[PDB]
Amino acid sequence: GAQVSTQKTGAHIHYTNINYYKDAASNSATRQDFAQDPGKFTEPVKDIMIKSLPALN
Amino acid sequence: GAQVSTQKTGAHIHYTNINYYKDAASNSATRQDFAQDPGKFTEPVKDIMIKSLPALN
Amino acid sequence: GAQVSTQKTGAHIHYTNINYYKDAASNSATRQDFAQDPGKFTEPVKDIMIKSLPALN
Amino acid sequence: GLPTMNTPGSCQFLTSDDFQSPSAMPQYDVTPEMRIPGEVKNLMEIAEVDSVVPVQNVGE
Amino acid sequence: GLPTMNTPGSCQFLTSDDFQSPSAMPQYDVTPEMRIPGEVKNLMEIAEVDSVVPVQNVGE
Amino acid sequence: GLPTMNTPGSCQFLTSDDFQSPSAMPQYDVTPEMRIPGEVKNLMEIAEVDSVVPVQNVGEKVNSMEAYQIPVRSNEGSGTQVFGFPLQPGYSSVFSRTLLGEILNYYTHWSGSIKLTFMFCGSAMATGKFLLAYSPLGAGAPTKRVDAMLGTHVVWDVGLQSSCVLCIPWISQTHYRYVASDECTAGGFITCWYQTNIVVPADAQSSCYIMCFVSACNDFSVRLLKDTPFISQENFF
Amino acid sequence: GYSDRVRSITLGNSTITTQECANVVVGYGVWPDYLKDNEATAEDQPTQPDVATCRFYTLDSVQWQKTSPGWWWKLPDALSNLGLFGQNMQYHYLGRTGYTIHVQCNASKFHQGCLLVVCVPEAEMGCATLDNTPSSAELLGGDAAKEFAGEPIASGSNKLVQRVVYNAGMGIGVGNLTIFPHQWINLRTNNSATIVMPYTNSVPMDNMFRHNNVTLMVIPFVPLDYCPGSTTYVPITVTIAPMNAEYNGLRLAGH
Amino acid sequence: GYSDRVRSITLGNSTITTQECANVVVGYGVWPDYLKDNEATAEDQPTQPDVATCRFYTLDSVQWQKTSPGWWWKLPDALSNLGLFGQNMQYHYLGRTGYTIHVQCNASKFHQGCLLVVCVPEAEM
Amino acid sequence: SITTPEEMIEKAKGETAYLPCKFTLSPEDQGPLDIEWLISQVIILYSGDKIYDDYYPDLKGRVHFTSLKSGDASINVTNLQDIGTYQCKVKKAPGVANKKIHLVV
Amino acid sequence: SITTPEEMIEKAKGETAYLPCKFTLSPEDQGPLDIEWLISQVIILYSGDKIYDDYYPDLKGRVHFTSLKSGDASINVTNLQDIGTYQCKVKKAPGVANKKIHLVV
Amino acid sequence: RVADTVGTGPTNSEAIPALTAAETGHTSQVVPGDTMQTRHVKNYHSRSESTVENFLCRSACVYFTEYKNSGSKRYAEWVVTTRQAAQLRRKLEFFTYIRFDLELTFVITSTQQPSTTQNQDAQILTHQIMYVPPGGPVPDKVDSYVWQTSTNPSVFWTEGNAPPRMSIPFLSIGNAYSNFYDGWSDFSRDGVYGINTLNSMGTLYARHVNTGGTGPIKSTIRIYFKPKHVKAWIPRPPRLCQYEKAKNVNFQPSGVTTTRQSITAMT
Amino acid sequence: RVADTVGTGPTNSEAIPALTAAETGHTSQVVPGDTMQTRHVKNYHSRSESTVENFLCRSACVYFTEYKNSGSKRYAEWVVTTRQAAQLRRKLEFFTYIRFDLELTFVITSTQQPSTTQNQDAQILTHQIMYVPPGGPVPDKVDSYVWQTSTNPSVFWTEGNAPPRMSIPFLSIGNAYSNFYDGWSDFSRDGVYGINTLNSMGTLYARHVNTGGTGPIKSTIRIYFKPKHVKAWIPRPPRLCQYEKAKNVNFQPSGVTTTRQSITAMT
Amino acid sequence: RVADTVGTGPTNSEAIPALTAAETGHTSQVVPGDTMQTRHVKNYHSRSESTVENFLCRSACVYFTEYKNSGSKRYAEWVVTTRQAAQLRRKLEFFTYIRFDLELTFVITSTQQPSTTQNQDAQILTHQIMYVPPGGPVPDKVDSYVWQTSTNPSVFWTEGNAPPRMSIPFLSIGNAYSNFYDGWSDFSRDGVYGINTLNSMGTLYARHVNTGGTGPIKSTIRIYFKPKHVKAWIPRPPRLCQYEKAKNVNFQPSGVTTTRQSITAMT
């Protein structure tokens, strides 16, 4: 029951991971999580402000 | 997810490689790369010079 | 990419071998080679000498 | 037993390695996660947010 | 890491074991073999060949 | 746990092993590669490129540009030897600091042909004929043009084309010769003679010079990497 | 009919013609081209004059005496003060450009000699005293010969660059230099030599004032020799033409 | 391009190169070849080295003074003492061989002269 | 790091001699800046953002920094007599560089 | 490496005795060439490309190299009286070979 | 695999392969058959060990420093740079630009220094190797807060274990490490000139985690660099003269080549 | 992977991207092309090492304590808390709430203390690290019944072995560790105020299983914390002033920023 | 598997299998049934342990040298050659030509040399084994630049670890190692004559990385050679007389065979 994922390589490869301990708190660090959403902190305004349009009409 | 490649043997065999670390900068040395092109340094002239034909006509 | 071969057992079983190093000069000793041909040293005469027939006619 | 040889670098400690390690307390039922407003997944999202710049950092 | 225990007999040297060991010089292009008359693959082939027997091994 | 026994050779350090090792800094975004003119993938491509050979390495001349020039002149005679050196691209001083020879000093076993390219840098009116000749190992170095005439030779003639190449063949009992000196694998002797005389018209120089280049043919191979004996060090810089 | 010797190179508004020439050496096999977007790193819109800068510039001629050891020109520094190539270099911060080096030295049939026209990337040179590095104006020359000296430069508390010709100032065999794109000027057959050099730097663009990527070295392997009665002053004139100039980061002039 | 003057002849293990040369004269129009069986008269199996003997031998240079009348070389006698061609000639009784004569004499543009390089069969003197 | 580490400055007696020790710091260098001047023994010291006369009898009140952490540590020795090798040792934990100046007259 | 390491050279008194120590070097041998001659104690030495008399009273000015690193280290002892075993020890770091010559009369 | 030779017989033609023009800069591509007669030999030889990767993949020590467990030099501080050594430096120089990953291996060796303290029963030594990235805080004493380790990559190795080996990914702001830099850091062209200006790879700190025992012990740490995944650009002639400094290419003028007896001598 | 730039030509329109209103609290999303001309550059750079997991996954020592094998301090007792150190504490504070698993690693180092007892031939030391969960029995002497180990998780490590490493799952009654707590434990609002009131993670005890030898030996144990599987909520400004205490956020007023020469100075 | 016997009954025929002619050089292929009556016995015996590979695959020490950590002999230099030992040398000689890969194993053993220095508390010894290929630079002192290791294959082994084992691929310019060479290196036929002229396999250097301690320690290194992937050609009679030298086949004349009482004696 081996999980195969791509290795972090340069720009312009696979590695095999098998979970030995059944606790699941012993799993290796989940580094490969490149997900972001700046809307929560940047641009938190209730009404959308198109950058091209004037801000305060 | 094991990669199987031929071993370096004599002239006139397989080995199994599994990438453990996910970083991909920890991979073993890529020795088996026998590719060459002498044109860049040897014979760098813009116009082809056929060896059999006279060089400076 | 594992190679499975019979183990040396008595008369009257399998073992698994995987080549780790890619050099191919690091492979375990090839002991299981039971091939022989005494003709090169024993019986090296150019013309066949049938044992039952007289040697020097 | 499986015949192995320990490569150089074994039995060492590295501050920047991700590996597995047996849990001291097995089968701990972690407290289920909830929704907290403003989860951060990348440091650069925080960098994008505005920050006042002390341009007049003169003297006192 | 994979949890292993070292069985007795580990970290020892045996004069009669066949195993693998990293090559000191990688990717050495060995000199290609040729045909040499009289390859021997088994010691018993040599035993089959005739050999004079010093039956009169008496004194001097 | 999986029961294992550690074979001999464990927990050791080898300078020539390829294996895996955890990265100190994980998930480092390397700087993307670009196109740089002239990528090299094999050392032998560099060996194939021409390199001037200091044939006149005599005395103090190794401390001047006179080391490369080989002197020729119009002398009242014929068969006079122009130069001569052993075929030891690794050990011979003539070849040692050339690009082919210095890269070879980083290895132990060599095999293949050599393209000795001789460029006549004399006047435009000078006409000289030369017997470039390579003698195979076995006998003493040729002392006269007639002795060298027998072995492999090219009668180079000077015209509109200047340079002529003497492609030294790979004659040897062993598939590979030692880069260092050895009686068993003596490479051979390479020499040049005057087929005729370098005749020149009046008001023109009679003392021309010849430059020699070295290169490896497309059948050149090296093996057994070793550290070079030319570099040296006392303490860290 | 056809003839290999004759060749005519036209660039910008100035072209050159060589009756006897050897085949052009195209760098490492890569003809210079503008920075592709797959590998760009400057977000500014680059200015590309393409005629104003890509033209044949003729530097100062130098005499080839029978005692002349050699000469070296830092290509970016050499053109720093000539025309718009110099002006735009002074203004813009980043600068990427290919080169079309062409060295002319014509002599009669009765002269003899041989030059090595080779362009060396990253010609880092060494000072006479081991501890300190050479100063600018000693290492660099503006439209100046920057001649090599055969004698080893005396080593004292100074910043004189080693001009030792048999080392080329880089502590390497001068004969082994051939690895770099090189064309020989053997007086007997070819009076001209042309090397088209691609932009060879580790970074997509670099400041030309900050660093000189390539340096044209002319090293006479065989000295000039002539019988009395022939012309005794045969010069070597170098015409370097930039190609595909691309400049970013417009700022106030200076350095 | 092409040029008639340049020519390169390779034989055995030794080749020659002439920048300026006139077209080769092929004897009487018959390129030399081995003895065909239609006209053989020796029943022994002939030895044919074909590399050991078929190679360019360079004889001794001679000075071309303004007073030099001429020179003559008996081709078989000339090579009698040079290499295997000489050794095999000394051993074997019968000998058949074609020839590839090549005479070199280079002079500057300001010299003048003219030689007649001619091979004469049966030069009974 | 220091510019022109080997230098020979000859100057006539009576006018101030300017001894430059300009230095450039690498990114790896993040340490307290210790600048010490030696003569052939300690003329001046710079530690903790302060300058020390160091009670040198031959050169007391005649030696001062011309400029500082900006990259200049030059000294204008005044009223020369002093002939010797002046060593300037700017100090950083990853690398410490020194410059030797021979002074004449 | 040395040719004929055991040798017995007998020569009459009055003429020079030629004692050969010709040696061949292996490819593995890349070391400073130290050639030392012993008698039964050091007659001559060759280190750093120079020859040493070694102040031997019995044989001073009568012993010299006939030839060198080329492979010859022979000695022509002149005006014999000297009877003993002459040992020539050419030295290389991987292997050092020695040759013993018995001299008579 | 290397190319093989092709058979050839006697030839007589206008075409000349030998006569060429080296002025063009094209090295003649002449095979042995062009100037002689040759047989068809199948060459099975392979240019496998001459590959750039195989050429520079050997582990090679760059610098060894020694730190005592008690005294003035409690910890060792070495700026990372391959220029300190000679063999590896010369190997890398062959290429003007080079792009390689690193596999640092540390060989640490202890030694009981001569002293007079009695009852010297030292416990097993423990060592720490810390890599400070450029611009990072650097330790001043053996026990400063920097040694605690916040984010810098450090390895703790008890003595008697297999030598520590941490791989390093390519670390350069540019697109390739520049072996040679003909440029100044300052636009003005006044200041340091050379490779040192553009190459900063951080600093390495080695210390004793525990004093170890009553008696003084001196620990020698040797650092080994093995380039891997190497790509090299623009080959250059090898350094003929001996290196004199680590931060610059300055050299002492040396003879092009070792001399011989005469121009016809065979030694 | 990071977003790339898009080409733009000269523009002249009523629409203004630069002019905005920062009063709204929306940071303008202005790309470089908006206020100039820019080329189309494909940026292959990746925000991979700026991830929260990669940011805080480095092992970092939090506390080192030293226990002798003979004398007053036979065993070492440290309450678990990441606030004792500075670098890791500051890293974690960036987020008001944080939920991470732990991978504790212990680096233990012994030292023969100076003494006068002769024939000091100590056998290999054996150490025990015991985690007492909050409310659990705590040892008073080095040999109490608590050390026997009933259910608490303890690790026995003989010296010279690879350092012990036990992973800890998230341990908090709430749904996330609170880095900052603006509250009192007491409803009355009288008593301790701060992070200490809500964060109790147990106590750690380290002792010598065997005395080891005749001579006194002092054992230094260093505890390393590496957050893994980290999820962070509500980012907060980094701690500007130096920490003064472990149980509270109390600080000494410090200059907003290091000063420079003038408002136009470039240093 | 070995061939078996075939049954035979009484026979009376002109054909004679026994009577033969040994002058021809053909060893008669006579089975037991030819000269008697025999039963059909299935022989299950296998000639498996008589294989050339099994015959020469045993690890066998070739040479042991001893280097001290302080004194005249700081490092040990041994030219590689299987002729130094007797058992392995004799095993290999059985075949005129042989082509085998090597698996060198080093058994290193230290020893506290008797001395008078007190407080001898030496730290664990570290050793380095370096293989200099022929023509390579060779170390002169224990601390020369050669020991740093540029490209030569060297192994660093701390004492107490499993013995170092590096495999060596076939290393010969010819197509097979020549056990016997009836030839001179010099065409003139004057000089060294024998196996030494054609067999050069480099030199092996062993040294102490660290001095180890105050007291002198002598380190014995034993080198073990085990041929693998062996192919042998032209079998030859085994060496009857005892070896006297390593570089030559010179021998002392010895009796064909140990004598017995009389030609009819049974002892």
Taking CB atoms and an 8 Å cutoff, what residues of chain L touch K150? Answer: 58, 60, 85-88, 91
CA distance M211 to M216: 9
CB H116 within 8 A of CB H101: no
Q: Which residues contact M222 (CB under 8 A, 6 or more apart)?
A: M61, M63, M64, M106, M107, M108, M109
Q: How many residues make up chain G in this entry?
A: 255
Give residue limits of the domains in chain F. 1-237
Taking CB atoms and an 8 Å cutoff, what residues of chain B touch K228? Answer: 28-30
Which method was it determined by?
A: cryo-EM
CB K250 within 8 A of CB G130: yes
CA distance F144 to F193: 8
- From B32's Cα to the closest Cα of chain K, the distance in A is 8
Torsion angle, CA of M196/M199/M202/M208, rounded to 10 degrees? -50
Closest by CA to K20, choosing from K35, K1, K36, is: K35
> Using CB atoms, which residue from K47, K49, K51 is nearest to E28?
K49
**Which two tokens mark A41?**
């902190």
Taking the CA of residue B5 as centre, how many other CA atoms within 13 Å lie in the half-sphere pointing to its CB?
14
Neighbours of chain J (3+ CB pairs under 8 A): F, M
CB F218 within 8 A of CB F48: yes
Torsion angle, CA of L243/L246/L250/L251, rounded to 10 degrees? -10
DSSP state letter for D17: -
- Domain interval for residue G81: 7-250
Neighbours of chain A (3+ CB pairs under 8 A): B, D, E, F, L
Residues in chain G whose beta carbon is closer than 8 A to a beta carbon of chain F? 27-30, 39, 69, 109-114, 150, 165-166, 173-176, 178-179, 184, 186-189, 198-202, 204, 219-223, 225-227, 229-230
Residue G124, number of CB atoms within 10 A of its CB: 24
CA distance K252 to K240: 10
CA distance L39 to G37: 8
Contact A34 L54 (CB under 8 A): no
Q: Do chains H and L touch (3 or more CB pairs under 8 A)?
A: no
Interface check G40 vs B, CB under 8 A: no
Give residue limits of the domains in chain L. 1-267
Q: Which residues contact D59 (CB under 8 A, 6 or more apart)?
A: L259
Interface check M132 vs J, CB under 8 A: yes
CA distance B43 to L92: 61
> Using CB atoms, which residue from B2, B15, B32 is nearest to C21?
B15
CA distance F233 to L16: 65
Q: K35 phi and psi, to 5 degrees?
A: -110, 20
Residue G6, number of CB atoms within 10 A of its CB: 11
Give me the residues paired with residue K109 across strands: K220
Exposed, middle or buried by CB within 10 Å (0-12, 13-18, 19+), for M7?
exposed
User: Strand G182-184 relative to strand G235-250: parallel, antiparallel, unpaired?
Assistant: unpaired
CB F161 within 8 A of CB K21: yes
Closest by CA to E39, choosing from M91, M45, M51, is: M51
CA distance H11 to B42: 29
CA distance L235 to L179: 11
Contact A11 F30 (CB under 8 A): yes
Chain B and chain K share a number of CB contacts under 8 A equal to 72
DSSP state letter for L217: B
CA distance L142 to L151: 18
* Helical (H) or strand (E) element with K87: helix K87-93
Contact K234 G193 (CB under 8 A): no
CA distance G27 to G200: 10
CB J35 within 8 A of CB J19: no
Interface check E14 vs K, CB under 8 A: no
Contact F161 B20 (CB under 8 A): no
DSSP state letter for K47: T
**Which two tokens mark D17?**
């390695």
CA-based max dimension of chain E? 72
Closest by CA to E20, choosing from B30, B8, C24, C5, is: C24
CB H52 within 8 A of CB H84: yes
CA distance K200 to K173: 10
- From L8's Cα to the closest Cα of chain K, the distance in A is 26
CA distance F46 to K50: 11
Interface check F33 vs A, CB under 8 A: yes
CA distance M183 to J90: 24
Closest by CA to D42, choosing from E29, M54, A39, K201, is: A39
Give residue limits of the domains in chain B. 1-57
Query: Three-state SS for M90?
Result: helix
Q: Which residues contact I43 (CB under 8 A, 6 or more apart)?
A: I37, I54, I56, I59, I63, I75, I86
CA distance K80 to K100: 15
- From I97's Cα to the closest Cα of chain G, the distance in A is 11
Closest by CA to M2, choosing from M56, M48, M52, is: M48
CA distance K56 to F41: 12
> Using CB atoms, which residue from E21, E36, E49 is nearest to M234?
E36
**How big is chain G by its Cα radius of gyration, in Å?**
19
CA distance G213 to G98: 10
CA distance G203 to G35: 11
CA distance E31 to G133: 49
Residue L124, number of CB atoms within 10 A of its CB: 14
Closest by CA to G228, choosing from G93, G78, G89, G111, is: G111
Q: What totals of helices (H) and strands (E) does chain M contain, helices first?
A: 3, 10
Taking CB atoms and an 8 Å cutoff, what residues of chain H touch B53? Answer: 1-2
CA distance K27 to M131: 37
Query: Three-state SS for B6?
Result: strand
